[PDB]
Amino acid sequence: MPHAFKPGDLVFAKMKGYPHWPARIDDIADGAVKPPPNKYPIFFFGTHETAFLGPKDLFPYDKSKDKYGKPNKRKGFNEGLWEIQNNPHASYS
Secondary structure, rough: OOOOOOOOEEEEEEEOOOOOEEEOOOOOOOOOOOOOOOOOEEOEEEOOOEEEEEHHHHEEHHHHHHHHHOOOOOHHEEEEHHHHHHHHHOOOO
8 A cells, every 4th residue: 555755756747737747756955945845856857857746746657657658749758758767766967
């Protein structure tokens, strides 16, 4: 049975106006800006951007990849598909 989200979990993350996007739950570095309450720091593969999202916009990657893991014309999407499949826990700094 599922736990709450934790850093390193792989998801597709939804934001308004964008397709379900390959992403991970990040850690928060010591000294770094924390997210708002009940939100998680989401690192988006391919674009390498961070947004703060709650669980309603987070779809576990294993369950969802059939549906959402197909190429998309949007900038950075296909690079992101490669990253979540091939090296999802690397440094993208």
